[PDB]
Amino acid sequence: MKLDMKQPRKQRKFLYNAPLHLRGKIMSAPLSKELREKYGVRNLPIRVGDKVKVMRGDFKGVEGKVVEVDLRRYRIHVEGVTHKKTDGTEVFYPLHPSNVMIVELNLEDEKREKIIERRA
Amino acid sequence: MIRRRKKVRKLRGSHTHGWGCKKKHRGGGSKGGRGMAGTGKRKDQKWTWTIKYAPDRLGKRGFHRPKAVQYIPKVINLNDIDENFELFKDAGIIYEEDGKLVFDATALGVDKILGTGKLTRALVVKAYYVTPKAEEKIKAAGGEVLLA
Amino acid sequence: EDINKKERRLAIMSAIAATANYDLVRARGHVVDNVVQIPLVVTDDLQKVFKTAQTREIFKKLGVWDDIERAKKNTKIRAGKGKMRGRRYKKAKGPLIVVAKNEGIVQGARNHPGVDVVTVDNLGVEYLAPGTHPGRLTIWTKGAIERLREIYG
Amino acid sequence: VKRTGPTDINLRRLIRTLRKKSNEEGVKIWKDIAWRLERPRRQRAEVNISKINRYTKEGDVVIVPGSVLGAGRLEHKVVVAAWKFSEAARRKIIEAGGEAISIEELMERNPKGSGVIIME
RNA sequence: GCCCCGGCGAGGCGCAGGCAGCCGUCGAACCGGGGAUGCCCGAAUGGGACCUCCCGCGGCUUGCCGCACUCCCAGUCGGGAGGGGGAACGCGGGGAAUUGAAACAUCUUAGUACCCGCAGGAAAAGAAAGCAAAAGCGAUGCCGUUAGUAGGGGCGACCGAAAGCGGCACAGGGCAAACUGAACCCCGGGCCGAAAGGUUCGGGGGAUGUGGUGUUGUAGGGCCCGCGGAGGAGCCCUGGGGGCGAAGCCGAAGUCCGCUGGAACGCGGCGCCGGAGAGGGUGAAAGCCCCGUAGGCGUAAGCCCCCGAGCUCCUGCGGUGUCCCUGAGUACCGUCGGUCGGAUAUCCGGCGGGAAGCUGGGAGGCAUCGGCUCCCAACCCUAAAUACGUCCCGAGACCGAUAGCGAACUAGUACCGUGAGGGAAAGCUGAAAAGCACCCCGGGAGGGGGGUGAAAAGAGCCUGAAGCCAGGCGGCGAUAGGAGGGUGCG
RNA sequence: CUUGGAUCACGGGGCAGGGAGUUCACCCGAGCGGCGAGGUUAAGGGGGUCAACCCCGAAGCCGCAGGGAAACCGACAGGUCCGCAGCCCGUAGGGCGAGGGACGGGGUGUGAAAGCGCCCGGAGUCGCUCGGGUGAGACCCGAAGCCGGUCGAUCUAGCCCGG
RNA sequence: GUGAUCGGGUAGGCGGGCGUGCCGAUGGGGCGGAAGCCGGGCCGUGAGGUCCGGUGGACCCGUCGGUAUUGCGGAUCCUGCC
């Protein structure tokens, strides 16, 4: 996407009122070296069914799996990453995919494969 | 260069800003009228100023002739002819033909040669008009004039 | 604000002669303990360098890398409402490269923080005296000095 | 209004040097020239070659606390010292067999200022 | 909210964080392009409106078409135009007063505010019956100067140009008449052609002149004569190539080791890229985590250029003349009103008079005579350079919620007035709701204990000041006289 | 404010935030700076790393000659004196002496003319800042009123129609 | 060094300094706790500056030069609160 503006307010406004076909890109995450030297790609947009390693936060180290993506808030959910309520019931803790590394890809769709052979 | 401070900045705290009593900086009565009002034609507030500083401002003296009729000549003095002797010689005006030296009347294109100034060298000058003093000083320097 | 040509040019010349002095350059804030000459004249082969790595190495061998590093380190986040309007990261000044003809040295050195590249037929007072403080660290070329021998200004 | 002084560090240095040189040698001409250089700018001296030639004589030494301008003709040879010169004045003085120099060099070539003439 | 073609590639159901559920991998939402449906009023239009709802006439098979007013072409059928809207900019008309002159009447304010009408994406002007002066220029329009000048004015206050010089941008064509005389235009249907274009039938007009020629100045054109016979510059797309052109795509390099901390974007150490150290986000201050950036690719329909493509509509050069033509209530003169710097010398209009017309006619700052110089009115079209910004991109020594637009927010909203019209207030939990499980008292709102959290920051939510109020502590305190203070000793 | 305020003269319940010599165009002066008998560019043009930067562009304005209503005419780059600073001789004083002051000579208008007025022995222009004057709302608030175009007779005045 | 021959001040004129917001440069600080708020210590004729403790939870100051919607007790001032 063309974003050529040295005005913070225009930047932030774009980020807030961006259309939905461009939010997946902003939701990109990095890959592991073991997948980079295999596919030749440094980042990809995130997708449910992918396995994840948390590289930042209180759940630093945890390995998990993606079960929910929310574009309107720019967040994701990872099984294994939850806190308890005062009741005692467990609820997910929402993460940003800048703090997350992909360690196993879900490839049962031709369009992801086309993405890869585009950027390799 | 020298950038000095404005004085409203010091008058902040003066209560009048240099104007006197609290009643002196109101309007047009404070000035005696908007503009050059009261100059002596119909009223006489500033008639004193008029007769001290601006006399000959009220009335009519003379006529003007039209611009289609006015032609203003160009004038050079012998001072200039002497102090510009090398440029006019380097380019144009002077023609060193058949002896002596010759000065021509078309530097700017001129009509009158006036007499202010001494002259050192001796030339032969050709111009429309030349003045008696100029003629005398040229003759003395040892040159001659030949009217066109 | 209007200014006259002749005053402008006299000021430009004074700024040149200032940058040619060692104590003014050291007082302005530049690291000069390794620099070799001050004024630093160098061949015209520097016009065709178009890679920031190569320029990094050349500056290390001359002695200006430490001034580039000072520039990078004294870059700071500004105080005020300018941060709303953008205009944060008050950036520091490094050295000038003065060049007769550009043949790649702009692409080559344009990213290094604080550095500027300029030709001699386009020389101004703000490249040489930022903030009204003369003594910027300047690297000239033979072509530039021989073009100044003509211009004188 | 507050009469500041000259803004040229070199003028100021010269003024101090002159006052101290007068103290050293035991004379007055240098202190006099100092207070004439320290006089307001809308008043500083402007002298012409007509004037120099009128009131000078072959071999004389002249000091102008200001600017010398080219308007007139110099018939004989002179040594003129001044702060500023014009191109035409240099030309005309060099021609005729003269010197156009500075007050620093005058104080070098003559500390006591014997025979010098002030033209303001 | 329904359909189709493309892009993106997995989630989605507006501001708006809910319950329950549906759509999507046969390619969605979203983005670009194109289509469908589209209640009533409204120019509002078949006819009517004290309530944005009612009442009808023909013709064809409940369903449909048609029927306002004023006009053009036709004419018994039909085919077409106008009407209303639009911030500022634009053309044409009508036209004040406050105020200033230290009162005021001529002047000024001012050809202003406001009113009436007419157009567009630009409008208006525009091709010398001109400017000038012994020399010369060559349509209009805009900038800078000329210049507060010439010049107007109770000659007061005040008002106020042009030519020229320097530049932007450049471009010229057509009628009327003379001379010919239907050799001409349009509509509808039919046959060729890919089309641009060409050929037949029936109607409308045109001898009160359709078509051709012709267009200007020390003259030009026609008729007559001779000689010569480069309208060939342009229209179209069955064709063959190119460039520009949507949504979009690719895009380098650390999440390395220790400490603080709820969390590194910090502090120490060791590295890497760079045509990329612009800007923003992410649990604190990040060139190397993500978007991007420097720099490269990609695009439909449509617009253009080279060629090939077939296709049009009248004619030059020179001579010679007792032949002809060249715009009328017009030029001009007097008078009245208005307007202008226009002064005995600006422009517009009314009234009364009024020409010549190529052996001719006009201008040259009072009128007239002569001389010289410049030009040919009373019919038409015309790009470029210019003005604006109800909009877009992009920027900022601008403001930062009593500021900045009146409106950072469900704002020209709520609300006020019969009405024309007037007009507010109101931003911020936290990294994550983890938005307080459970127990005791209370009719209940709620209080007290316990819990979450790095911190109650507890939605009556960042920080949380003063004035004000209650309580606790300290000092004084029911025989006492000054604007509530100063100096000194307790 | 006032000659005059503790006043039986005006303003004055408390706190917090807002709140009054600005901008243009011309003119008079100064504090600095550049060039200098010359000074200075405007619109605009070209180049660039593209609102910063660099080069060209003197059209015009001021100045170098003034007098006079106009026609028109058209001047001292120093002849004398007194003399501050500073220099020379010295021992108090005396000599030259720029800038400064006073005479003399000249141009022109007016006049038969003499004499009088203005003028002539080379310094101005271009910028930044500041003080001020004049005009524009012109440091901030306050009128009664004058003019223009639209709205209203559900109040009240009058008239008609039907009750 | 001199001042027996300086030391009150309305209108008014002149000189130097304190403080507030933004720019171009230079030098620094900050989650081991920035700005702001409360109470106190020291310097300063003074306008005001700086430190200690507490509260608070992300930005801020100095010197040089420039710029400005640049300083309040009052207007029968405006807004909000008491």
Curated annotation (Swiss-Prot), chain A:
<dbReference type="InterPro" id="IPR005756">
    <property type="entry name" value="Ribosomal_uL24_euk/arc"/>
</dbReference>
<comment type="function">
    <text>One of two assembly initiator proteins, it binds directly to the 5'-end of the 23S rRNA, where it nucleates assembly of the 50S subunit.</text>
</comment>
<dbReference type="InterPro" id="IPR014722">
    <property type="entry name" value="Rib_uL2_dom2"/>
</dbReference>
<dbReference type="GO" id="GO:0042273">
    <property type="term" value="P:ribosomal large subunit biogenesis"/>
</dbReference>
<protein>
    <recommendedName>
        <fullName>Large ribosomal subunit protein uL24</fullName>
    </recommendedName>
</protein>
<keyword id="KW-0694">RNA-binding</keyword>
<comment type="function">
    <text>Located at the polypeptide exit tunnel on the outside of the subunit.</text>
</comment>
<dbReference type="GO" id="GO:0003735">
    <property type="term" value="F:structural constituent of ribosome"/>
</dbReference>
<comment type="similarity">
    <text>Belongs to the universal ribosomal protein uL24 family.</text>
</comment>
<dbReference type="InterPro" id="IPR041988">
    <property type="entry name" value="Ribosomal_uL24_KOW"/>
</dbReference>
<dbReference type="InterPro" id="IPR008991">
    <property type="entry name" value="Translation_prot_SH3-like_sf"/>
</dbReference>
<dbReference type="GO" id="GO:0003723">
    <property type="term" value="F:RNA binding"/>
</dbReference>
UniProtKB/Swiss-Prot annotation, chain B:
<feature type="region of interest" description="Disordered">
    <location>
        <begin position="1"/>
        <end position="43"/>
    </location>
</feature>
<dbReference type="Pfam" id="PF00828">
    <property type="entry name" value="Ribosomal_L27A"/>
</dbReference>
<dbReference type="InterPro" id="IPR036227">
    <property type="entry name" value="Ribosomal_uL15/eL18_sf"/>
</dbReference>
<comment type="subunit">
    <text>Part of the 50S ribosomal subunit.</text>
</comment>
<feature type="compositionally biased region" description="Basic residues">
    <location>
        <begin position="1"/>
        <end position="28"/>
    </location>
</feature>
<dbReference type="InterPro" id="IPR021131">
    <property type="entry name" value="Ribosomal_uL15/eL18"/>
</dbReference>
<dbReference type="InterPro" id="IPR027386">
    <property type="entry name" value="Rbsml_uL15_N"/>
</dbReference>
<protein>
    <recommendedName>
        <fullName>Large ribosomal subunit protein uL15</fullName>
    </recommendedName>
</protein>
<dbReference type="GO" id="GO:0019843">
    <property type="term" value="F:rRNA binding"/>
</dbReference>
<keyword id="KW-0689">Ribosomal protein</keyword>
<keyword id="KW-0699">rRNA-binding</keyword>
<keyword id="KW-0687">Ribonucleoprotein</keyword>
From Swiss-Prot, chain C:
<comment type="function">
    <text>Forms part of the polypeptide exit tunnel.</text>
</comment>
<comment type="subunit">
    <text>Part of the 50S ribosomal subunit.</text>
</comment>
<dbReference type="GO" id="GO:0019843">
    <property type="term" value="F:rRNA binding"/>
</dbReference>
<comment type="similarity">
    <text>Belongs to the universal ribosomal protein uL4 family.</text>
</comment>
<keyword id="KW-0699">rRNA-binding</keyword>
<dbReference type="GO" id="GO:0003735">
    <property type="term" value="F:structural constituent of ribosome"/>
</dbReference>
<dbReference type="GO" id="GO:0006412">
    <property type="term" value="P:translation"/>
</dbReference>
<keyword id="KW-0687">Ribonucleoprotein</keyword>
<protein>
    <recommendedName>
        <fullName>Large ribosomal subunit protein uL4</fullName>
    </recommendedName>
</protein>
<comment type="function">
    <text>One of the primary rRNA binding proteins, this protein initially binds near the 5'-end of the 23S rRNA. It is important during the early stages of 50S assembly. It makes multiple contacts with different domains of the 23S rRNA in the assembled 50S subunit and ribosome.</text>
</comment>
<keyword id="KW-0694">RNA-binding</keyword>
<keyword id="KW-0689">Ribosomal protein</keyword>
Curated annotation (Swiss-Prot), chain D:
<dbReference type="InterPro" id="IPR022947">
    <property type="entry name" value="Ribosomal_eL18_arc"/>
</dbReference>
<dbReference type="GO" id="GO:0006412">
    <property type="term" value="P:translation"/>
</dbReference>
<dbReference type="Pfam" id="PF17135">
    <property type="entry name" value="Ribosomal_L18"/>
</dbReference>
<comment type="similarity">
    <text>Belongs to the eukaryotic ribosomal protein eL18 family.</text>
</comment>
<dbReference type="InterPro" id="IPR021132">
    <property type="entry name" value="Ribosomal_eL18/eL18-A/B/_CS"/>
</dbReference>
<protein>
    <recommendedName>
        <fullName>Large ribosomal subunit protein eL18</fullName>
    </recommendedName>
</protein>
<keyword id="KW-0689">Ribosomal protein</keyword>
<comment type="subunit">
    <text>Part of the 50S ribosomal subunit.</text>
</comment>
<dbReference type="InterPro" id="IPR021131">
    <property type="entry name" value="Ribosomal_uL15/eL18"/>
</dbReference>
<dbReference type="GO" id="GO:0003735">
    <property type="term" value="F:structural constituent of ribosome"/>
</dbReference>
<keyword id="KW-0687">Ribonucleoprotein</keyword>
<dbReference type="GO" id="GO:0022625">
    <property type="term" value="C:cytosolic large ribosomal subunit"/>
</dbReference>
